[PDB]
Design a protein around this motif. Structure first.
Motif, PDB file in Angstrom:
ATOM      1  N   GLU A  88      -7.859   9.997   8.280  1.00 13.43           N
ATOM      2  CA  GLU A  88      -7.578   9.629   9.655  1.00 13.43           C
ATOM      3  C   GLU A  88      -6.760  10.720  10.346  1.00 13.43           C
ATOM      4  O   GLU A  88      -6.910  10.940  11.546  1.00 13.43           O
ATOM      5  N   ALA A  89      -5.885  11.393   9.596  1.00  9.46           N
ATOM      6  CA  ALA A  89      -5.106  12.494  10.151  1.00  9.46           C
ATOM      7  C   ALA A  89      -6.020  13.670  10.513  1.00  9.46           C
ATOM      8  O   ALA A  89      -5.810  14.309  11.538  1.00  9.46           O
ATOM      9  N   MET A  90      -7.035  13.933   9.685  1.00 15.38           N
ATOM     10  CA  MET A  90      -7.967  15.026   9.926  1.00 15.38           C
ATOM     11  C   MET A  90      -8.990  14.664  11.011  1.00 15.38           C
ATOM     12  O   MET A  90      -9.427  15.544  11.740  1.00 15.38           O
ATOM     13  N   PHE A  91      -9.389  13.389  11.087  1.00 11.98           N
ATOM     14  CA  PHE A  91     -10.464  12.964  11.969  1.00 11.98           C
ATOM     15  C   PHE A  91     -10.007  11.756  12.782  1.00 11.98           C
ATOM     16  O   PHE A  91     -10.504  10.649  12.602  1.00 11.98           O
ATOM     17  N   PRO A  92      -9.049  11.936  13.717  1.00  9.31           N
ATOM     18  CA  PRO A  92      -8.406  10.797  14.368  1.00  9.31           C
ATOM     19  C   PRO A  92      -9.417   9.941  15.127  1.00  9.31           C
ATOM     20  O   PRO A  92     -10.302  10.458  15.800  1.00  9.31           O
ATOM     21  N   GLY A  93      -9.274   8.620  14.977  1.00 11.32           N
ATOM     22  CA  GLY A  93     -10.107   7.656  15.672  1.00 11.32           C
ATOM     23  C   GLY A  93     -11.451   7.427  14.974  1.00 11.32           C
ATOM     24  O   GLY A  93     -12.295   6.726  15.536  1.00 11.32           O
ATOM     25  N   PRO A  97      -2.337   4.195  12.159  1.00  6.80           N
ATOM     26  CA  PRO A  97      -3.048   4.066  10.887  1.00  6.80           C
ATOM     27  C   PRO A  97      -4.512   3.727  11.095  1.00  6.80           C
ATOM     28  O   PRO A  97      -4.871   3.117  12.096  1.00  6.80           O
ATOM     29  N   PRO A  98      -5.393   4.051  10.133  1.00  4.96           N
ATOM     30  CA  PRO A  98      -6.781   3.602  10.203  1.00  4.96           C
ATOM     31  C   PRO A  98      -6.784   2.088  10.006  1.00  4.96           C
ATOM     32  O   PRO A  98      -5.907   1.536   9.337  1.00  4.96           O
ATOM     33  N   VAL A 154     -15.026  -1.877  17.971  1.00  2.00           N
ATOM     34  CA  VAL A 154     -15.540  -1.142  16.842  1.00  2.00           C
ATOM     35  C   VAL A 154     -14.372  -0.786  15.926  1.00  2.00           C
ATOM     36  O   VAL A 154     -13.223  -0.773  16.348  1.00  2.00           O
ATOM     37  N   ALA A 155     -14.692  -0.548  14.653  1.00  2.00           N
ATOM     38  CA  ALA A 155     -13.715  -0.199  13.634  1.00  2.00           C
ATOM     39  C   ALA A 155     -13.195   1.214  13.865  1.00  2.00           C
ATOM     40  O   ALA A 155     -13.874   2.190  13.543  1.00  2.00           O
ATOM     41  N   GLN A 156     -12.008   1.277  14.471  1.00  2.00           N
ATOM     42  CA  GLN A 156     -11.332   2.518  14.816  1.00  2.00           C
ATOM     43  C   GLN A 156      -9.875   2.189  15.156  1.00  2.00           C
ATOM     44  O   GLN A 156      -9.565   1.072  15.571  1.00  2.00           O
ATOM     45  N   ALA A 157      -8.985   3.170  14.964  1.00  2.00           N
ATOM     46  CA  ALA A 157      -7.571   2.990  15.240  1.00  2.00           C
ATOM     47  C   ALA A 157      -7.342   2.637  16.713  1.00  2.00           C
ATOM     48  O   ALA A 157      -7.830   3.359  17.594  1.00  2.00           O
ATOM     49  N   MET A 158      -6.544   1.564  16.937  1.00  2.00           N
ATOM     50  CA  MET A 158      -6.209   1.027  18.252  1.00  2.00           C
ATOM     51  C   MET A 158      -4.817   0.367  18.166  1.00  2.00           C
ATOM     52  O   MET A 158      -3.899   0.807  18.906  1.00  2.00           O
ATOM     53  N   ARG A 177     -18.253   7.993  13.473  1.00  2.00           N
ATOM     54  CA  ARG A 177     -17.269   7.187  12.769  1.00  2.00           C
ATOM     55  C   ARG A 177     -17.776   6.941  11.354  1.00  2.00           C
ATOM     56  O   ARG A 177     -18.979   7.039  11.107  1.00  2.00           O
ATOM     57  N   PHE A 178     -16.857   6.651  10.427  1.00  4.10           N
ATOM     58  CA  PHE A 178     -17.262   6.410   9.050  1.00  4.10           C
ATOM     59  C   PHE A 178     -16.188   5.631   8.291  1.00  4.10           C
ATOM     60  O   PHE A 178     -15.012   5.631   8.664  1.00  4.10           O
ATOM     61  N   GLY A 179     -16.632   4.944   7.238  1.00  2.00           N
ATOM     62  CA  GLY A 179     -15.739   4.144   6.428  1.00  2.00           C
ATOM     63  C   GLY A 179     -16.296   3.906   5.029  1.00  2.00           C
ATOM     64  O   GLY A 179     -17.492   4.067   4.809  1.00  2.00           O
ATOM     65  N   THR A 180     -15.397   3.535   4.111  1.00  2.00           N
ATOM     66  CA  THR A 180     -15.775   3.135   2.775  1.00  2.00           C
ATOM     67  C   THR A 180     -16.273   1.698   2.828  1.00  2.00           C
ATOM     68  O   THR A 180     -15.658   0.852   3.460  1.00  2.00           O
ATOM     69  N   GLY A 181     -17.393   1.419   2.162  1.00  2.00           N
ATOM     70  CA  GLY A 181     -17.969   0.083   2.189  1.00  2.00           C
ATOM     71  C   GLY A 181     -18.400  -0.385   0.799  1.00  2.00           C
ATOM     72  O   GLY A 181     -19.592  -0.544   0.575  1.00  2.00           O
TER      73      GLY A 181
END
Ligand code: CL
Ligand code: CL
Ligand code: CL
Ligand code: CL
Lengths: 338, 338, 339, 337, 337, 339
Positions: F93-98, F166-167, F335-339, F67-71
């Motif tokens: 998010e479209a390329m790397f879902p979840g 959405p992310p 965890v920070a992920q689409a749900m 998983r990854f995000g901008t911080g």
């Protein structure tokens, strides 16, 4: 009862001197009213004209007894500040009482882009138009007024040259939302030719808007501007539409396109089929008559006819002889006046 | 040979009255009309301000007089320069040889309504010079663009364009702008003033024209004067006090915003203040000598504004007793497309 | 019942700041207790011929006298002066000279404000600007860190560190009924020019009504008037002095849009003695000056600032000190513009 | 012959105290005053910021000292250049021969309150140069107009104008602006710095003056220094830490907006950081040698800011032990009309 | 030295599909990828618009293909030029020798979303030229400042900077900008057009390069073409009508704001309108001859966009029957550092 | 719960190619997520890097299962218009879902000043951030939207490349007010290391904000980014922090400072004592473990660790061996992920 029909004076196509002479002829031949577009540019170079309508209307007023209106002016602060449109309208009505109607609309880039400013989306320009209406109506009270809104600022201003009764404000639109607002805020509607379902929707919206504001829509003008091509043969009528009015076959929003040269290049795609329901192209004057009568039957109280061919004199005489005498108008239909 | 200009006072008179009086002026030997471009009168007692551009169409269509704006400010408050260009081109196209475009730096009285920063005179001169550049580009009849300090014009063309553009006349009382007028434009319009001031303006204009390779003997030098004629001297004085107190205000008036402001300032004005600014007398010989003196200084056209409401009687009096006795140089240039 | 006093108007439009300083020192010796100083950039006419920076001069006045003083008036509406700067200046003067300064503010004139080359709003709009400026000044006068964002002004985190215990009062200078009411509602007191009795009563009435509707007691709030007079050895000299020195006093028309001294100079050529009726008292008779001032006290003005329009300032000051000020009768507990 | 400038620290001291101390400084042999134009102090612990223009009127009327702003930013944040011109002209008209107008590119600490875009230093220099043009036009005493990149002036005239304008002094530590100061203005004001930096600034100023046909030997070259005198070395150090931690911040400070920001940064400052920036000692001979060295480099005026709250004692100590022993060149130019 | 470029159509295809197809294209003999920088598709039926910069990272990390934007508008609507510079520098730093920065004057379809004045083409060219100046300053890898008519850059430096900058390629069909491209940039990208127009653009580019002392024979001249391959001619025609009606719009498209606008205009487009703009045929020999002709005109790289949704089949067909038969000049310059 | 920890990829310090390789190693060693700062400039020249994060995230996504995000990214219209951030987030998010989470914040002058625009105070930038969130959320509906507010204008716009879900939008803040707004308006919180009292307050505010908007905060991520220095000796760990991350010892607001050269000069004042409570500096991996466990116990559901030294590979292996296996996470922690 009595014979009548509106003539569209196409500033995009014709020198103002020719339009003046043809309007004088149209009056002799039974037309009772004139619609004049407020352009800076023609749609195409082949059309090749764009007179300043406000000057020409003075000449028309002084040499005929026709009713006349702008079809339409954009008073939204590109070419024209709304205060100036108000003054111009008031002057024409003061000089020619009972004869002028002020047609307004949200404008097109073709004309407005010359001043080099941000061009809003249609929905935003509607909001500008509604604010412009507020400005014009304040000035039409004939008192000293001020205004500060999102789009316009007016410092202490008064129209000292003001007729006893203001000219009607007519909105030119094809949008259901603005048609309703026109009924609520203004005096009448002007719309382009379209299929029966679309026209009924616009009329219905206009009526609902008027009724909700306590007005009687049966006393308010509902006007339509149509484009036709009459000539001696069907083939000539079709050729005239292709060459002179290809924009008539462009069934898509045109309000963002800036240059005549842009429309000119887009015109190369247009074919006869694209004029179906948008430009009637035939030599058969009975068919012109039936087309117009149908619009009256839908509930339009005035029709302004633009013949797209350069054969304006012949068109005017043909309509005067074979079309206008056979149209049946309701005797109590409201006209755009007073 | 006999001729004189009539000033049509939009500040004072309903446009319908002005139209009828200009028609009469033509019958009585006046050959030209000057029409102010106002939004407001100087005072409520004057009480009018028609939209001049519409009225000029009516004048053009019902007379053979020459006519011009005296003056329009094309500096982007009420009017964008591109619109003034189009309006001028349309009038000249409709009435060839008859229109002259008079322009100037404008007054707050009219321009303040749009609620924008009002520059000092010297800055407005710079705006006027840029506006002239815009108008002249459009008068080429080609597609042009413009980007300067004050104005932006995207691709724009006047499709309705006479073969020869109308002359651009600048209305100014400043030596600097008079010189620039000779250099950049076709002719000068100035108000009444003492001999020394008038000679300076003429001289500056001529020097400007010569330095740009032009022949100033072929270029119009025009003056607008204010008079009060009536049956008695006493009535002539009373008319000036009541109708034109601004004529007795020997101070810059370009920053004053409201008719109510001039109205309050007018309470200070007395007959003495009109000395050299408004000739007030029943003696038509004295009117004749005053005008002849201006011709002798080198003015090629004079526009006379009678300040009283007795316009018809003034026109007939001048037609009978003044105009036939004026002696104009044989080949004197008039403001017309050359 | 109250002790002898009167205000002196220091005319920055007419007089060199050094002369004004010396004359204020003399005025103090002669029984004046307070000074009103205009905040101009330009004089009305070239013949007036001066315009000192008032804020610097007030420091000199404060340090060399015990007079009270105020601006009559400053425009804190963001042309020459941002409201935060006016607040700081006012706070500094009151901190240096406690109990002596009052901040007089107004909606301004083009004559002074046009130099910065910005859009000049109509009077009604400038009133709105003035009201917002008052809000800014009052926030800064709390002596805390404040922020502000309104239609006309933006203030980032700002604090007046040099701040007296008690702020100087904010006085609005206006001749408009509406703004007089708003002054009572929003501010600490009123300053108005000389005018006929009917106009003055209307302004006082509006001010009082505004104060009462906001739950305030107007009897404790200053009501101040600045009067223009012409005293000289003869009536004829007094009239001539007014014509030459203060023709703007005979201009009964709005003056807030006129930009240049040269404009007023040309307009002045129309002014005649009759135009000073009710606006400038012109007489050598000092009993009549005394009665005129006493009448204003009796109307309910709690302070009067006198501007003598002639260049005979020293002689005026001595004449008033001898023949006018000792005979004025002030109510004992009349509120003065002070912390 | 004997003289020295006193820096009146508006950041630290109530204006009434500054007025009294300047009066004392005059009695003790100081001949001139430098007053900063701030809206905010560097820290809350400093705790003041009087409006300098009002105070200068009081100073002018109660002393015979020369005085100047050190410095005002006339670049249209707190102050439009036309207003600074009027203020300067009024002070010089009231106190002829006594005022000098010190100007500079300003700091966010004071200018940020008006909520406008804060340009980088090089851009603010361009604004300062345009402001100088405006001030100089107004100082002609005629009706002038101006339109440039940063400022607009409509028809404006200073009617209250001395016969001879006050000198314009630029406060800068930048080589480029020092050269421009020589070219465009009347003199230079710079902060304390090492010998090499000071020589470069003097050299640039001189070159700028000479290229404009001026004689730089007749033009003021002024320096403002920060010191800490007290009864013991330890007290002098403690005073600098508590009162003037900004003096130990060897980094650009012109973008920092709030006193609370400097206050938090101050927690990092230690005695070592004042080396070469604030002289901290009880030894008045050492104060004397430090000042004399600056005269020897070619500075024609020195303004001394004592950072401690012991201003009265500092003034008397300098008056007794320092000022009489300074040796100034005989015909050294001072900032005056 | 068999090679050809693949156009990755962000307007039509999900980024995951484009990634997989580019990986396949590499296996099949394509050596380079062109990726458009859109926010919106031309029509809803196209139905996509991925953020190209993120996708290029994935492409770089999973292939050895060269790749470039075709094109980005760095003129301050969606993208400030400093950001484009940083993005380009990062890609080239991560994938040395592989990235080329294609830039252009932009279209309202993408730029209108930020709600700002949209200048005429000639004015946007002036903006593009200023953007090039900004990008080139940043590519020096030093601290730079910039102030022009359209852009302001405060002290800025690209710390993550390859040893050699990526080439700047301008995408244009205008003679004037083609000349400026030769003068100011590293190479040209142009759309398919008739022989006369292509020769004029090449000629202008060459003249611009020579007048600036450059050798245009060492500079890339690239073309992007649109084709429709399918199993039958009829399917190829139908694919072009449904998927790429904008290809049959021989008129300026840079002012049209909405996909819905193009969608309505598309109703007028017919097969005839694709003549010379989209080659529509199942005959792979004819694809080969069309491409070879462009090489013969002097283009050093060709990027092929197949308009149909049959991307996998197209890639395999070109790999088998087209790419091996193309004859490239031996030392032709390619877009790379 | 299963073993995990976040790795902070320091764009200020490290070449993007090195970061890519180290994230791949971190995955092998038991880290499950990456936090990547969105900078244009490093804090200091000695740090010496600043890759364009959006391009790098594509490479990370395609070569790992992390998983990854901008911080964090500032979507407030300096470097980045909010519509562009929305598109970028949607594409990742479209390329790397979840896998992607969109971390946003109010930004720093260090990065934003390059475009040469007015830099608002923090409270104003918060208002800009809240409006940006509105824009991003409208675009995340996947429909044609328009927007006109105080700070942003969006004409008819639609994200055609849009994942089904959405992310998450994660706000990075240390302010109680914005933490509450984050709970109300967004999907999760990211905060820096701080004392227990401050951390509890932020968590509490976030939870209260979520609950008052009818949301369930137990399912919403509460994330913390901490800075540490591990090395072979304590002395090396201290030296690494001084040289590489002096900004860590600057206990003062840093959002207005424009240039790396400014931080560089300020860094000369920083000493070991200044890192107390801000950077843990020790070779003792048991002490690293206890520090992290304490943060889990406070209620943080994810921790992103930035080792300030250049010894990234050795740090990653040390944490993988001695720290990550011993951390005890609650079983169902969000965890920070689409749900
Ligand atoms: Cl049509
Ligand atoms: Cl007159
Ligand atoms: Cl008065
Ligand atoms: Cl940190």
């Amino acid at each position: 009862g009595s014979s009548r029909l509106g003539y569209s004076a196409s500033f995009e196509q014709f020198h103002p001197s020719d339009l003046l002479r043809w309007c004088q002829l149209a009056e002799q031949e039974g037309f009772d009213s004139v619609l004049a577009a407020d352009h800076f540019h023609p749609w195409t170079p082949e059309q090749g004209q764009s007179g300043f309508v406000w000057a020409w209307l003075g000449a028309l007023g002084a040499t005929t007894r026709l009713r006349f209106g702008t079809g339409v002016t954009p008073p939204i602060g590109f070419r024209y500040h709304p205060a100036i449109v108000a003054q111009a309208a008031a002057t024409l009505e003061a000089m020619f009482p009972g004869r002028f109607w002020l047609g307004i609309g949200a404008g097109e880039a073709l004309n407005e882009h010359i001043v080099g400013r941000y061009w809003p989306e249609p929905a935003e320009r509607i909001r500008m138009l509604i604010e412009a209406i507020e400005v014009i109506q304040k000035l039409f009270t004939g008192k000293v007024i001020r205004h500060e809104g999102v789009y316009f600022k007016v410092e202490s201003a008064k129209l000292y040259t003001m007729p006893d009764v203001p000219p009607p404000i007519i909105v030119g639109t094809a949008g259901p939302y603005m048609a309703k607002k026109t009924g609520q805020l203004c005096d009448g509607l002007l719309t382009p030719g379209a299929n029966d379902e679309k026209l009924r929707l616009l009329l219905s919206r206009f009526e609902e808007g008027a009724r909700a504001a306590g007005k009687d829509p049966r006393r308010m003008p509902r006007m339509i501007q149509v484009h036709v091509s009459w000539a001696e043969t069907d083939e000539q009528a079709i050729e005239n539409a292709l060459r002179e009015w290809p924009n008539g076959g462009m069934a898509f929003p045109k309000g963002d396109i800036r240059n005549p040269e842009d429309f000119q290049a887009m015109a190369r795609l247009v074919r006869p089929e694209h004029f179906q329901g948008r430009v009637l192209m035939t030599s058969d004057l009975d068919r012109h008559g039936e087309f117009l009568q149908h619009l009256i039957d839908l509930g339009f109280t005035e029709i302004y006819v633009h013949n797209v061919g350069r054969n304006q004199e012949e068109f005017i005489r043909a309509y005067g002889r074979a079309v206008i005498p056979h149209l049946r108008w309701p005797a109590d239909a409201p006209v755009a006046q007073a």
